[PDB]
Amino acid sequence: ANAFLEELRPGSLERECKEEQCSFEEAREIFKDAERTKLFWISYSDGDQCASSPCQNGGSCKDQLQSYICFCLPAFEGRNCETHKDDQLICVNENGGCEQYCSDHTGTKRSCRCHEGYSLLADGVSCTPTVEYPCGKIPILE
Template identity: 35%
Template structure:
């Protein structure tokens, strides 16, 4: 007797029979394969292949899982440099860099010295999102060597001499009774102050510390 129930179990009855189909089959003779792909179980553009009582999804790039419902986290491998933020996409990611960094993975330290921020000959050292200026020997100070150092702040001109600040230097205007220390000292007349005559010592950092003898015009 032929197998009436092709993919099932046949049960005899009085003048009849009944087929009990295996999972995945239907029909009076259990001869019809149920297409599990008809319900579109594969998500996010996945392709469905019908199997016996089952299906298989082929996922597009960026998704995984039985139904292609899981977005693969491309940020899980920490592709962005430390301190930067990874934003996951579909089969991709984007790095949001912290200040001072650039590049696809925020791997490039931006050269903050490229714009030459250190004025007046200061030497620039690049840092992360910043720079440091070495102003030594320039006569200037400040974050960008922008402030002229007041060499008169230490009151280097003695015996009542007046100090005039210069760049990395100063000059003293001495009373007539005093002179400076430089051998190249020259003198210029200075207006009287309270009837006391002064002379301008014009040279290198004279300090008005030597008492000038009568008729003396300097140490040079």
């Protein structure tokens, strides 16, 4: 930046662009050449897109040119880690984790059910055969 008489001093990237914000011209006075100043300018002028702290739920932001990338904690996803993996327990999502039948319910958790010949186990998702020859199982391989 420019104050009274400072421009009598030779240009300095540190003093003018790092310790202060510099205009394109101040940069050109340091680098001299056009292609070199232009190259410095791209990244310097780009700005830090991570300033809004776009990555939610404890995610980390990494600045890029005119964009950013969010690294999310294990239970989150989305461009900004806005999606909670645990809130996705519905039947269309890997059958709600049910071994056989899945039933969606609004207002409460989804439930698993089994085909005749099977009964739902204690874990609420697996099924076990109650009969000797349940359908869909190959005896000589069991």
